[PDB]
Design an enzyme around this catalytic site. Sequence first.
Site, PDB file in Angstrom:
ATOM      1  N   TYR A  78      77.970  11.697  -7.562  1.00 56.82           N
ATOM      2  CA  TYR A  78      76.860  10.722  -7.537  1.00 56.82           C
ATOM      3  C   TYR A  78      76.192  10.698  -6.155  1.00 56.82           C
ATOM      4  CZ  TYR A  78      74.424   6.419  -8.925  1.00 56.82           C
ATOM      5  OH  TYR A  78      73.491   5.488  -9.277  1.00 56.82           O
ATOM      6  N   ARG A  98      68.264   8.229 -24.575  1.00 54.80           N
ATOM      7  CA  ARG A  98      68.913   9.239 -25.442  1.00 54.80           C
ATOM      8  C   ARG A  98      69.045   8.774 -26.903  1.00 54.80           C
ATOM      9  NH1 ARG A  98      73.701  11.297 -25.129  1.00 54.80           N
ATOM     10  NH2 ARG A  98      74.718   9.391 -24.388  1.00 54.80           N
ATOM     11  N   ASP A 114      66.552  13.230 -23.144  1.00 56.33           N
ATOM     12  CA  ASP A 114      67.564  13.334 -22.078  1.00 56.33           C
ATOM     13  C   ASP A 114      66.837  13.944 -20.887  1.00 56.33           C
ATOM     14  OD1 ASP A 114      69.610  14.383 -20.406  1.00 56.33           O
ATOM     15  OD2 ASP A 114      71.017  14.402 -22.076  1.00 56.33           O
ATOM     16  N   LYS A 118      72.291  11.613  -5.206  1.00 58.08           N
ATOM     17  CA  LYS A 118      71.387  10.581  -4.647  1.00 58.08           C
ATOM     18  C   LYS A 118      70.888  10.983  -3.260  1.00 58.08           C
ATOM     19  CE  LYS A 118      71.344   8.012  -8.355  1.00 58.08           C
ATOM     20  NZ  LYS A 118      70.088   7.905  -9.139  1.00 58.08           N
ATOM     21  N   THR A 135      65.311   2.006 -21.519  1.00 62.58           N
ATOM     22  CA  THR A 135      65.708   1.271 -22.741  1.00 62.58           C
ATOM     23  C   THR A 135      66.763   0.206 -22.432  1.00 62.58           C
ATOM     24  OG1 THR A 135      67.454   2.786 -23.330  1.00 62.58           O
ATOM     25  CG2 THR A 135      65.231   3.281 -24.212  1.00 62.58           C
ATOM     26  N   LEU A 136      67.312   0.191 -21.223  1.00 66.12           N
ATOM     27  CA  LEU A 136      68.430  -0.707 -20.853  1.00 66.12           C
ATOM     28  C   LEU A 136      68.288  -1.122 -19.398  1.00 66.12           C
ATOM     29  CD1 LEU A 136      71.284   1.614 -22.095  1.00 66.12           C
ATOM     30  CD2 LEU A 136      70.624  -0.563 -23.152  1.00 66.12           C
ATOM     31  N   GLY A 137      68.937  -2.227 -19.055  1.00 66.19           N
ATOM     32  CA  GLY A 137      69.240  -2.603 -17.667  1.00 66.19           C
ATOM     33  C   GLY A 137      68.043  -2.539 -16.739  1.00 66.19           C
TER      34      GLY A 137
END
Lengths: 251, 251, 251, 251
Positions: free
Chosen positions: D155, D38, D62, D159, D15-17
Amino acid sequence: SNRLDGKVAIITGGTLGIGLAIATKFVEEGAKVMITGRHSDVGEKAAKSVGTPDQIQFFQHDSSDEDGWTKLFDATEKAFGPVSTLVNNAGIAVNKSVEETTTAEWRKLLAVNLDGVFFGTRLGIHRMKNKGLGASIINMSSIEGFVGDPSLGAYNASKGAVRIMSKSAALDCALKDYDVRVNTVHPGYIKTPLVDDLPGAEEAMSQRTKTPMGHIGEPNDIAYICVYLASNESKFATGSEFVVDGGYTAQ
Amino acid sequence: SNRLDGKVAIITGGTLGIGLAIATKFVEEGAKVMITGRHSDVGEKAAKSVGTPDQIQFFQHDSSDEDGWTKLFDATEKAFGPVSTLVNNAGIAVNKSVEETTTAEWRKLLAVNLDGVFFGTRLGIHRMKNKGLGASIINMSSIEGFVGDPSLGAYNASKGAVRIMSKSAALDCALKDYDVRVNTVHPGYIKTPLVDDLPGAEEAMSQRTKTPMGHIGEPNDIAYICVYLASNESKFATGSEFVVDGGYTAQ
Amino acid sequence: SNRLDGKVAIITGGTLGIGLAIATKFVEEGAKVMITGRHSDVGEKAAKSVGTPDQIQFFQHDSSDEDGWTKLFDATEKAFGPVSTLVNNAGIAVNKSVEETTTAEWRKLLAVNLDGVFFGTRLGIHRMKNKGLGASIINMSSIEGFVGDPSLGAYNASKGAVRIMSKSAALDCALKDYDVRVNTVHPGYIKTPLVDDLPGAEEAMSQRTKTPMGHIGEPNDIAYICVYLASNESKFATGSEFVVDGGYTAQ
Amino acid sequence: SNRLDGKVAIITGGTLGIGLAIATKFVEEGAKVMITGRHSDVGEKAAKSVGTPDQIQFFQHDSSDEDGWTKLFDATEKAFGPVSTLVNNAGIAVNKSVEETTTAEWRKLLAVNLDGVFFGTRLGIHRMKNKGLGASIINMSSIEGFVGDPSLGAYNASKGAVRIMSKSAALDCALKDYDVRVNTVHPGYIKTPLVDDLPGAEEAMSQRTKTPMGHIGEPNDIAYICVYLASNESKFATGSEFVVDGGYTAQ
Ligand SMILES: [Mg+2]
Ligand SMILES: [Mg+2]
Ligand SMILES: [Mg+2]
Ligand SMILES: [Mg+2]
Ligand SMILES: [Mg+2]
Ligand SMILES: [Mg+2]
Ligand SMILES: [Mg+2]
Ligand SMILES: [Mg+2]
Ligand SMILES: [Mg+2]
Ligand SMILES: [Mg+2]
Ligand SMILES: [Mg+2]
Ligand SMILES: [Mg+2]
């Protein structure tokens, strides 16, 4: 040769196999050692088999147990003085593909193999920084942290996580002059009584398409690289991966 | 601690800096050592500074000189008995981008850094296989074998070549049960008299964006990982990369 | 889909196999292409098979020939205007272990696989920088630039060198705002008429212990990743390795 | 150019970026897309901004929510027919060192970044295998899956886990002829409205010691490598890492 003169080490999963060999060589090189394991019957016998209580003791602990980590560092300091060295060796395996890993299997394996290493590494930095100890955190991160295995999906996830999380910790400790190094050790296949208990396992692991040397290793192969990393000989090594695998990952 | 009991080592570029520290620690651990270098004035003094001729000798040689390699192995065996251990440490650098590397610079650097390692590794396998020596070939392969540097184009080429050529050799020796291991060592920046001779070099190398520890290493940092790799302690390690770099490649 | 609108590409070893598929897809995406090869008989036929001389031409050249590189860039610019794109694809193999590689074999393979890539990359940076071309140098760097093969010693050396030399060039071009990207492509085993000419080769390469997909690739598998890297779609990709190998290096 | 003819894709965090750019380019190349996020307010607007409901829809989810994954695959198949393509892009960050990561922060980040990718990859293999779809699972695995950052400890763990877990899945799908590929994409720093909201962030990320190109990327830089990996152009690529990072990891 007293290569670990004055060091005080915690070895998780130190009661058997690789962990017990690391403990044995650490004591032989002059370190004071606290080994951990889940089973008091095994751990009491293991500590006594290596040395006297002035050299080595046992603390019952599941590495997934966050609050027990605090109790473990306190018990070790009470026995031997401030902890200098942490080997995050405790681990479990699930023999499932990603496709066939149940969520319960996934969470149980990550609790030991990833949360345990995180809890130990985090607490170790708090307790071992800024004391002139030449502190060293050694995280067991597997050849399965470099390559996939179709039947070790959750294990691969855990070992990839340990590999790169350890670099983060290494960098923060270096940049802040904490006198704490963090490195990973990546064993290939190693002969232990547990491998011996699995008919055909050693032969499969020894095929040239798996281990080019045509045989598997032995617990002391991992103990000796851990002595180097715990010692001040490795004072310029941090954020590095050390592979001992009979050529597995070279092909 | 006699960790290299009975070993017989050739160290190329053993008369200065990293090579001289490897030679010094090898002699201290019970190895017999032949060091090489281009300058008889430097080499004669260097051997005498480490020990007596029963422990360490000098042989004048440019690692790019193919026929001299045969003479070097014969001289070492005549002095000390069959060679068990080869450290391919001799190297040069060019401070040029790929764009600005002359062909003469390119060929000269590859002759030392790549042909020298090839000639030594090839001859070493012929001379050290199938003798029960626990033979070990250790190739110096740099952090510049993992990451680029815009001003080290030819050096990067040479060190990437050494990195992967060494895996080929490791695999062939493992698959054929030659009792020869091949591994690479990847130093980060190391303080030597030559770095000291370059104003501002150590300060630039010690910036946190280069070496996260905020200082550079010392020749013994590379000597100690070489002792491990030359010793039988590393008998299950082949085809592996060992980085000692103050965190350079971890970020 | 005109993904290479206005691009002008040189593809070395473009007359056969992988290089010819890269040339074919480049022309289909709107690039003007100069292919090279050693054999005028093969090259004249290959260019005509792909397109008309306004789309694709042939220039006879051995990538090891330094002075011919200048003639090649001039011929391409005369035909098509300034060169934007270089694919260093020409290569040879020797089926020898390091132990059994003759010096003549070593030097011949490095002349094509390493000097050719160096000469092309160096000249490409000089000719393609600072022109707003969205320039891209793509160096063929093999799965043999990541892992060893016991019977490809010199090939492994060459491909490891290309891998890390390419990062050096990428960095210098990025830091100097040259508008030149440098990346490596690492094919696994690919079906070509030459593989077809070697009885049993494809079956050996297709075993699950070699290629997990259980078959080998096809030249267009390498052409499509090269279109991406030559296009402006990859304008933020430099210094990177792109592997297309059926899972070979994942295990 | 209809490069994703007939494909049906789920993009988490679409939905973004980066996720929204992947969705936009997927629709432009002929895929039918279900984006997740979300926030129903954001997702409803995002789907409508890209295309009509015959091209793209939104499903609120989510990625840490295991049971919602089943509902998501059913909704996508109901809208568009069988799912061929999964992009596991949803992620969060914690700006803490390992030392300063709270257990709540650790578990929350791993629930999205690691459990979400596991749940999506596991379910995707079950739903997309053995259907002739040319199925492709693309896991967002960061430059932080290759190198540490002292302030991204959790993070980095997540990853690194995605990086190697994805190889396991790739191998099992290849060995079992499931017609499912699994690959990872590793973005460097990318300009988004969220980076724009953090004063000084883009300038810090654009320093040459971070991104050698001296600027950060843009969401379409990640969209284009995802189109390649979702397309049949990449049918021989599995278990591979694709880095698009402006040179960050090359130095
Ligand atoms: Mg126990
Ligand atoms: Mg195999
Ligand atoms: Mg490192
Ligand atoms: Mg492999
Ligand atoms: Mg000298
Ligand atoms: Mg290896
Ligand atoms: Mg030809
Ligand atoms: Mg890179
Ligand atoms: Mg949303
Ligand atoms: Mg930097
Ligand atoms: Mg791979
Ligand atoms: Mg770096």
